[PDB]
């Protein structure tokens, strides 16, 4: 590798994406990691690890279909509108994106927002649980897993991804390019002009590859390992359709504590 004009431009693109990333996403990985590792003295979050601590934490949890799981999905998808608008605003900063066909812009985003939301949810997760209520609470992984079916199986595949994705130790500089690569995926069904999309992603992939070489000297094949994580992201999104059919076939008890219903609406 050499520091030539082309590498200089790729560093300028990584900086441009990072600055736009910071403007668009107020909840960065660094802020989440500071809370999870206790480095922030300003927002020590409450820990919800069982039904007893859940009812003691009624203070912090701040509060239309009939099925509980459907109402959870409707609510978290409504709560996720601000994230979708932030991802869409970030996409406008990707050089060449707004020049693409408008129908392709909508198609690229409507498939991409789900995978990006899961990527940023991993920043809120460690092996023990996930942050909720804007970092004011901490919901443990095993407590979620212990809830009655089908709710007990909702989040566990996401924790398994998050543990493997966080082991790559990406920072917000890395994530800014990775998010842009996800958006410019030429394989989305219904795309009209795949060629101009891949031309942009080719540029983003070069900028990502150089960023990872500069930022992670002790990671062999980090570029490849990170691209393989997109397979795990896609499978999680795909399995949400299957999760709907599990609900329509469960005639057992589907009632959930109202505080738990509110916590799930802050997830995805």
């Amino acid at each position: 590798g050499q520091l030539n004009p082309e590498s200089a431009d790729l560093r300028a693109l990584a900086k441009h994406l990072y600055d736009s990333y910071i403007k668009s996403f107020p909840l960065t990985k660094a802020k989440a990691r500071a809370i999870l590792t206790g480095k922030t003295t300003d927002k020590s979050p409450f820990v919800i690890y069982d039904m007893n601590s859940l009812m003691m934490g009624e203070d912090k949890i701040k509060f239309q279909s009939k099925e509980v799981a459907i109402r959870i999905f409707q609510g978290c998808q409504f709560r996720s509108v601000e994230a979708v608008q932030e991802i869409t605003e970030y996409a406008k900063s990707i050089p060449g994106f707004v020049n693409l066909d408008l129908n392709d812009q909508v198609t690229l985003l409507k498939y991409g927002v789900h995978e990006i939301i899961y990527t940023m949810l991993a920043s809120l997760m460690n092996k023990d649980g996930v942050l909720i209520s804007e970092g004011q609470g901490f919901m443990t992984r095993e407590f979620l897993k212990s809830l009655r079916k089908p709710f007990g199986d909702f989040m566990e595949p996401k924790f398994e991804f998050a543990v493997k994705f966080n082991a790559l130790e990406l920072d917000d500089s890395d994530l800014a390019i990775f998010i842009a690569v996800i958006i410019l995926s030429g394989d989305r069904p219904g795309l009209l002009n795949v060629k101009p999309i891949e031309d942009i992603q080719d540029n983003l992939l070069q900028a990502l590859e150089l960023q990872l070489k500069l930022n992670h000297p002790e990671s062999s094949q980090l570029f490849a390992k990170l691209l393989q994580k997109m397979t795990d992201l896609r499978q999680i999104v795909t399995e949400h359709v299957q999760l709907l059919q599990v609900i329509k076939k469960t005639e057992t008890d589907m009632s959930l504590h109202p505080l738990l219903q509110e916590i799930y609406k802050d997830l995805y």
């Binding site: 409707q74 509108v81 979708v84 608008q85 869409t88 707004v98 985003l109 409507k110 927002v113």
Partner: peptide
């Protein structure tokens, strides 16, 4: 839900 998201995205792109 899907066209709802497409309309959210269309409005945000304006």
């Amino acid at each position: 839900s899907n066209l709802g998201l497409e309309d959210i995205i269309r409005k945000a792109l304006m």
